[model samples]
Target: GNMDSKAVEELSATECHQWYKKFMTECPSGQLTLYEFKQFFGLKNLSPSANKYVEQMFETFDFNKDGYIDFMEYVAALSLVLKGKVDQKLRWYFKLYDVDGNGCIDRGELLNIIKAIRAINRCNEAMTAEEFTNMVFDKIDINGDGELSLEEFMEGVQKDEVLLDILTRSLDLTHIVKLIQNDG
Candidate 1:
């Protein structure tokens, strides 16, 4: 996060390899595909275009000459370069959930976090991407048209209980874990 390209590039190939090895070992059977990685991060499901995007991102982030992504490269790409401020906010939210920081946040981790936050807000549900999208469809469609304006997402979360609930469950952990297991 220091934003120094020299520091990033200066990381040794050996370090990269070691990081990759450790990451694999920790990740269940010790491997993951790009699609699985996306699902882990709650990206949209794999469409042809999404597949292409994954390939592009992989090629872009696999910094070392080696064929695979190492841990530092993965974190740098995910946290520093690609994600920006909103991603940083998400990371903070993740940190709140990932109290252990073992590099993987599972359902139990999320449940603890949501439980605490919801208790504070006195809300029964958690925020999710799908819920936000649906709310966009509901609130901004002033013409009673079945569509949402770009401003909705750009501005903030919209208001609609049904849509809100949908979003509250956006990143499905079970589906992601199954995907990760398959990747290994």
Candidate 2:
């Protein structure tokens, strides 16, 4: 995984302290629960399953598993998404897709990920889950196995514009810091 240390370090102690103060101003309680986080973003027109996707995203950011995101973890996670190196991004996406954490995305894993994407997009006319899975496997399961290796997924996403777009469409993380900065 690639990480840009210089950019990450730009959020120095003083900067993080400022962020913490502002976050507290906005949050008032000094921490953010998953539900509160979702409310903060005010996601609109979410499908029922969309909450699953949101929960996963929250869990990814709430690294300490304390059921809340404090300012420090929030800044670190935000940095990873917004300006981390390419390999870091790829690793993050791999972890996201490898729901079971078995090292690769099996068919069920891929299906669940695609379902999350569909839920996030609220695409009512999307293809059936099975149909979509078959199509994706046909395209990217280079080894012809029932599972997709990280390499396969990584290469496929890099080479396929549509795949990349679909994977990243709902993840508008670029402006998160700016949004939070403006919030308070």
Candidate 3:
């Protein structure tokens, strides 16, 4: 169930998107900007479009204009309304992506965060954006479209067994938080 770099390398954008949907549903608080998405999926250096996507996600989700998700707004999205843990977890996730700590995040900086995480996990294999995207497409993308719709992304998780197992098992909320705490 472990998703190594080779497995990641072979993933298609479709598969990655599917993984995203599942990740969000299971860990709703872990919202990702497009840049963060590219990084985790190993597509950071691929296209200008990736930056645009991150901006889109940020603009759409940052409802309060506070420059950060804060506590309730973030928790509410996840359906987890606990104020303290929400703030704590969100802050940790924010810090994970917002590497520069400028109270806001953009694409380039976020990619570095992704790289950093992979390095920490010892999965830092070199991969081009196209290769990464191809890997994502092969697994999650059902329609062969250049991008995955929300439904398509969701279906990858809802349908695919091996991927679903890897994703769900890999996502340990406490383990992530603890990684941040210990690393930070």
Candidate 4:
């Protein structure tokens, strides 16, 4: 299937063209592979934990399951991350958090991932990560099953206003915005 129809719908012609040009300038290697994806964000010194987390993000953007992300994939990911529906973005975020490839998430995975993101973002967390991670599971794990399934994460996180905001914040992509700003 032609991949860009939905993306094009989400992005106007001018905006899509601008984004294409930005992707080209940022990639510089024809398209984005995992390594190029790392370079695009200037993620040169990520801790080992955060490093693999970025790879998971890159793989998610590679929508076709191919080795690299082409223009359509790039635009689609941008559309979803920047302006797509909340449920849609939640689905994407769920995939990003399920780092073990086991289709479920545990406390250690979520905690490490949050801390990894905190390190990359260099933002002060202001409180212990354990409190946040524990709070999420305590509130949402309806069956009390230590691991979070897609259904639990999507449904539980969506309905809880407090957890919704925190989870949404974790998926924020200001680095991309800053990159576009620099280009402008």
Each candidate's TM vs. the true structure? 0.27, 0.59, 0.34, 0.59
Q: How accurate is candidate 2 locally (lDDT)?
A: 0.62
Given candidate 4, what's the lDDT at residue 130? 76
lDDT (CA) per prediction: 0.41, 0.62, 0.41, 0.65
What local lDDT does model 3 show for residue 88? 41
Alpha-carbon RMSD to native, per candidate? 15.6, 8.4, 15.5, 8.1
* lDDT sort, best first: 4, 2, 1, 3
Worst 10 residues of 1 by lDDT: 169-178
Report the C-alpha lDDT of model 3 over 53-102, residue by residue, as the tens digit.
33443443354544544334443333321122422443444443444455
Q: Model 2 RMSD to the real structure?
A: 8.4
Colliding residue pairs in candidate 1? 128-167, 131-167
Candidate numbers, best TM-score first, in rank order: 4, 2, 3, 1
TM-score of 3: 0.34
- The better-scoring model by lDDT among 3 and 4 is 4
Candidate 2, 117: how far from true, in Å?
3.8
Regions more than 4 Å wrong, model 3:
1-65, 70-72, 77-133, 165-172, 181-184
